[PDB]
Amino acid sequence: DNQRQYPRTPLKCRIRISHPLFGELMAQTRDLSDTGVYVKHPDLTQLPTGSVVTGQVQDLPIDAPILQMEVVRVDAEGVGLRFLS
Ligand SMILES: Nc1nc2c(ncn2[C@@H]2O[C@@H]3COP(=O)(O)O[C@H]4[C@@H](O)[C@H](n5cnc6c(=O)[nH]c(N)nc65)O[C@@H]4COP(=O)(O)O[C@H]3[C@H]2O)c(=O)[nH]1
Ligand SMILES: Nc1nc2c(ncn2[C@@H]2O[C@@H]3COP(=O)(O)O[C@H]4[C@@H](O)[C@H](n5cnc6c(=O)[nH]c(N)nc65)O[C@@H]4COP(=O)(O)O[C@H]3[C@H]2O)c(=O)[nH]1
């Protein structure tokens, strides 16, 4: 029954989410796998599915990677994102 290719573990960090038209905001992750991340913020919950956002974790010693992510789903609290190839 498990349809996840990779397991998810809790991870909470500050992440900047940006989109060319919708603008940017600072959110927090909730959980992570090798293929995707859930990002919690009320203002993300109306992103269309298929939106492509960039995310970059904040406040790391090193500059974090800037990741392209697809919005695969929204819920009451945020969005499920999949990292792009
Ligand atoms: N479309 C979509 N929705 C997603 C995805 N991941 C989470 N959700 C949504 O978020 C709810 C809560 O997920 P959860 O806390 O991981 O809590 C999950 C998790 O513990 C487990 N679960 C369900 N399906 C899977 C699965 O394929 N693999 C694993 N490992 N757990 C699953 O059952 C709980 C309840 O599942 P749901 O009733 O389905 O309720 C899910 C579903 O509505 C996803 O990749 N795609
Ligand atoms: N960390 C994280 N990543 C997320 C979340 N929601 C989506 N993703 C990412 O987006 C991918 C594709 O999600 P999907 O198209 O809904 O495709 C999902 C969905 O159809 C199903 N699925 C997995 N978990 C659940 C679940 O809890 N409930 C339901 N209903 N479906 C699930 O299995 C497919 C493949 O799941 P994955 O291989 O995990 O692949 C997931 C994962 O990399 C989330 O809450 N947290």
Side-chain angles (χ1 to χ4, degrees), residues 38-59:
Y38 180 92
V39 176
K40 176 176 194 312
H41 198 283
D43 296 340
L44 291 171
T45 62
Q46 313 214 17
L47 278 172
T49 59
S51 294
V52 173
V53 299
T54 63
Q56 184 185 31
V57 173
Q58 303 295 290
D59 301 333

Side-chain angles (χ1 to χ4, degrees), residues 63-74:
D63 280 353
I66 299 166
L67 295 173
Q68 303 295 129
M69 299 181 289
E70 187 187 19
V71 176
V72 302
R73 73 186 192 79
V74 304

Side-chain angles (χ1 to χ4, degrees), residues 1-4 8 73:
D1 55 351
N2 171 21
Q3 308 150 93
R4 301 174 188 177
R8 303 173 185 171
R73 73 186 192 79

Side-chain angles (χ1 to χ4, degrees), residues 2-4 6-9 30-39 70 72-73 75 79-83:
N2 171 21
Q3 308 150 93
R4 301 174 188 177
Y6 290 85
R8 303 173 185 171
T9 50
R30 174 188 286 177
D31 58 68
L32 178 63
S33 66
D34 285 6
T35 55
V37 64
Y38 180 92
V39 176
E70 187 187 19
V72 302
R73 73 186 192 79
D75 68 15
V79 287
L81 305 172
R82 182 183 77 77
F83 301 126

